Swiss-Prot record, chain B:
Pfam families: WD40_Gbeta. This is Guanine nucleotide-binding protein G(I)/G(S)/G(T) subunit beta-1. G proteins are composed of 3 units, alpha, beta and gamma. The heterodimer formed by GNB1 and GNG2 interacts with ARHGEF5. The heterodimer formed by GNB1 and GNG2 interacts with GRK2. Forms a complex with GNAO1 and GNG3. Interacts with ARHGEF18 and RASD2. Forms complexes with TAS2R14 and G-proteins; these complexes play a role in the perception of bitterness. Component of the TAS2R14-GNAI1 complex, consisting of TAS2R14, GNAI1, GNB1 and GNG2. Component of the TAS2R14-GNAT3 complex, consisting of TAS2R14, GNAT3, GNB1 and GNG2. It is linked to Intellectual developmental disorder, autosomal dominant 42: A disorder characterized by significantly below average general intellectual functioning associated with impairments in adaptive behavior and manifested during the developmental period. MRD42 patients manifest global developmental delay commonly accompanied by hypotonia, seizures of various types, ophthalmological manifestations, and poor growth. The gene is GNB1. PANTHER family: GUANINE NUCLEOTIDE-BINDING PROTEIN BETA G PROTEIN BETA. GO terms for cellular component: cytoplasm; cytosol; extracellular exosome; extracellular vesicle; heterotrimeric G-protein complex; lysosomal membrane; membrane; photoreceptor disc membrane. GO terms for biological process: adenylate cyclase-activating dopamine receptor signaling pathway; cell population proliferation; cellular response to catecholamine stimulus; cellular response to prostaglandin E stimulus; G protein-coupled acetylcholine receptor signaling pathway; G protein-coupled receptor signaling pathway; phospholipase C-activating G protein-coupled receptor signaling pathway; Ras protein signal transduction.
Swiss-Prot record, chain C:
The chain crosses the membrane at residues 23-42, 52-71, 91-112, 124-144, 162-182, 210-230, 237-259. Residues 72-90, 145-161, 231-236 are extracellular. The chain holds residues 531 to 801 of 835 of the full protein. The lineage of its organism: Eukaryota, Metazoa, Chordata, Craniata, Vertebrata. Residues 43-51, 113-123, 183-209 are cytoplasmic. This is Adhesion G protein-coupled receptor E5 subunit beta.
From Swiss-Prot, chain D:
One of its GO terms (molecular function) is G-protein beta-subunit binding. GO terms for biological process: adenylate cyclase-activating dopamine receptor signaling pathway; cellular response to catecholamine stimulus; cellular response to prostaglandin E stimulus; fibroblast proliferation; G protein-coupled receptor signaling pathway. The chain holds residues 9 to 61 of 71 of the full protein. Keywords: Acetylation, Cell membrane, Host-virus interaction, Lipoprotein, Membrane, Methylation, Prenylation, Transducer. Belongs to the G protein gamma family. Its main location: membrane. GO terms for cellular component: extracellular exosome; heterotrimeric G-protein complex; membrane; plasma membrane; synapse. It is a lipid-anchor. This is Guanine nucleotide-binding protein G(I)/G(S)/G(O) subunit gamma-2. Disulfide bonds: none annotated. It comes from the Eukaryota. The lineage of its organism: Eukaryota, Metazoa, Chordata, Craniata, Vertebrata. G proteins are composed of 3 units, alpha, beta and gamma. In this context, interacts with GNB2. The heterodimer formed by GNB1 and GNG2 interacts with ARHGEF5. The heterodimer formed by GNB1 and GNG2 interacts with GRK2. Forms complexes with TAS2R14 and G-proteins; these complexes play a role in the perception of bitterness. Component of the TAS2R14-GNAI1 complex, consisting of TAS2R14, GNAI1, GNB1 and GNG2. Component of the TAS2R14-GNAT3 complex, consisting of TAS2R14, GNAT3, GNB1 and GNG2. Component of the TAS2R14-GNAS2 complex, consisting of TAS2R14, GNAS2, GNB1 and GNG2. It is found in: Cell membrane.
Amino acid sequence: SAEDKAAVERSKMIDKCLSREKTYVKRLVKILLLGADNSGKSTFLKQMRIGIHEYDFEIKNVPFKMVDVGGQRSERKRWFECFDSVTSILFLVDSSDFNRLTESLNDFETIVNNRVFSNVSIILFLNKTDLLEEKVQIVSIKDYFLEFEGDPHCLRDVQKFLVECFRNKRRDQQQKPLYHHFTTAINTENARLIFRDVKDTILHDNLKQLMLQ
Amino acid sequence: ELDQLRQEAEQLKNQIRDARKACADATLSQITNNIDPVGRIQMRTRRTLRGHLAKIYAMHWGTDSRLLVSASQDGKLIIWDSYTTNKVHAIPLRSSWVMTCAYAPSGNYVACGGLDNICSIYNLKTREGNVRVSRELAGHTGYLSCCRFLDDNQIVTSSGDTTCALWDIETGQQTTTFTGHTGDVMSLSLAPDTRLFVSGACDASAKLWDVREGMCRQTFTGHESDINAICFFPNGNAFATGSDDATCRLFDLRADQELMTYSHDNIICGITSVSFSKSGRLLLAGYDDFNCNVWDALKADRAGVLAGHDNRVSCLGVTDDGMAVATGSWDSFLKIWN
Amino acid sequence: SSFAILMAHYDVEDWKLTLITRVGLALSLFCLLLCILTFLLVRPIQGSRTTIHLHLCICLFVGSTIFLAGIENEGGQVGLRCRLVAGLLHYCFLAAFCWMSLEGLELYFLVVRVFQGQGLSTRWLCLIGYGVPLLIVGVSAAIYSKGYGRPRYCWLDFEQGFLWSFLGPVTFIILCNAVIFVTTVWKLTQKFSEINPDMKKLKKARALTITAIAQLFLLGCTWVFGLFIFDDRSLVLTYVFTILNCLQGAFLYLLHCLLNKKVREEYRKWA
Amino acid sequence: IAQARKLVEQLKMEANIDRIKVSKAAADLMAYCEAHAKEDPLLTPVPASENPF
């Protein structure tokens, strides 16, 4: 009856737009991005481009959505369940700054041990690796971490200790692995690293689905 | 200095508890023992609203009891015509983590918000039918959890600041700030006369506020977990509250205490949404067990079950005329029940 | 009479093979009807997996029923009904193999093109798995319609090489599915320790064996024993093919309904 | 300092509130539910002619 037909046509147009974006939705990969002000998060995001902010980009024709939580923590079930569909958590840390390493470890422990983030993988980026070579051979990480074992002036020992410190803050039932990369925020290989880690995580899920028992 | 005031607070709390005990002479169940039960209540899905691509977190009815606004994780609002299952609008949002949505009583504006810390106002009726952001309300330091229009110009929002705010949309300013909660405020409910409103926070407490004076008239306790939903009784002299302890409670404003508890042993999951029927006899509650339970509000009896959804029933809604019930869920579907 | 007629380059005759075929096919038809009900009713398991499984089971059920009812010829003369049932059997089993190739393609989408959403819809799956057989059967009938039916059985004709119209697609699908099966097994063995860290080595072998066998019965690699049936010299291969492929529906039912946790949960919820 | 004083003052305003008996409140809720039972489509289902769904 004149207006009814127009209303149905408008509904059909809206449905067509929704169907057009549905294929993108079913094929999108979401990653949490967590980092402090010293972690080089802004430089990392700017290099890949070249409140909570959403970054949309594509790697090898796969749509990605990095969710940048700008230091907002809520420790509530609703806030964590808002991110129950992410495939991975990306964590940037300033590996050089030993005085703020404990704060980063505590934040990591608070986030990755939530029941919502069970069955999501962790990609851990240790930025400022070039600055570690300067800071190593000048200061000793034993001055900040008395549990350190090895040569504090060796880069491999310090890097292994940092990755072990972050791995030990993950409680039991680690269904998904922890991926660590020693990179810089201006590195051009970071997108490929994230792509490979996410692909491995999704392969883990797919093979677990193939598991009969 | 500190010890004296700490003891004074305890004495005042004991005095309030004693007054509440003195006003409690006969329980609601005892008085309503002689009222006949409402019997089995069967509601059937009349409409299924499909089109959302992700979990539906919020939903609000219109004053005309025909139009419907819904919010989903995919990052947009849809205005539905429930009589004909027609999409009137599809409004993309700047932030995809929307947690609440409001529909103005006039029908000219809708509101939404979430993790973006902003209450965004959209004008539905502009020139040549273009829906644009009329106003963005900033000032909340936490995620915005609920919003309800008082009129086209003022709106009350609750956030993770443990505070509520009354806004002026024309100026975009917080006219009045409501402080006093210790946990994150998760729910709101405007009184039918629009003069009072109750808020439920993550401190197992509900507070009654005066919009004009900006003060907490009463504080209600009794729950054991985070209050997720709250709703006034139709007459405005009482309200209901659902929390994560698998329990609904009915609180009286004038008696200033809990009247009766809605719970069952078989229910252990949290309650996401509560609503009343037009007469107040039915208390509809949505649960994490994929179901919506209908309660006899005067006898604390399960009148019926709404069991059409496949995921968490995240929102409920009853029309002003009381004809239909809209249930939103995490399966990206809205269902209309009679 | 025997299930090996679908692959044999001669007229296989053995009462034991006929009895095995009848018993196994009755049991498999019961299990395949159960499979169709499970794949159509159990909501939590719905997906591309379940769609391809359901349509493969439908094709196997229809083909097995037509085989049980009309594979034998009476009177020694090839009538019109014999051509019709020959063509129907050709279409049904070629459709089953097309849906098996779709199983393989979906497995490729799982283990190689790991990211989800890049796949084929239900309409395209049905179009492929029900129209490629239609194309092949139509072309074969147009070229050589006299190849449908024999005086002994109502299934193709090996004198002019017409049986390769069924064997060639089967061979191609079997080789492709074998490649994807080896890839799947390799990836699964690589990642089992990460997926299940504390399931030991004996239970590792048990789980890997069960999963590999389920995929083998999905992909149709059990039909490779029929590609070497030319003479009486291959009785062992003939019996192996008949036993493994008359029980294919039953094995699929076991390994994909009785060994699925969600199916058991829905079964318990139903009762 | 300020927080304790504000809490005490708020509790003082909460204490000096004219409360009524819960029997009267239950009676008022009963009266409202009984006065509007015929106007509730969910409690009393409406004939299909007058149901817009």
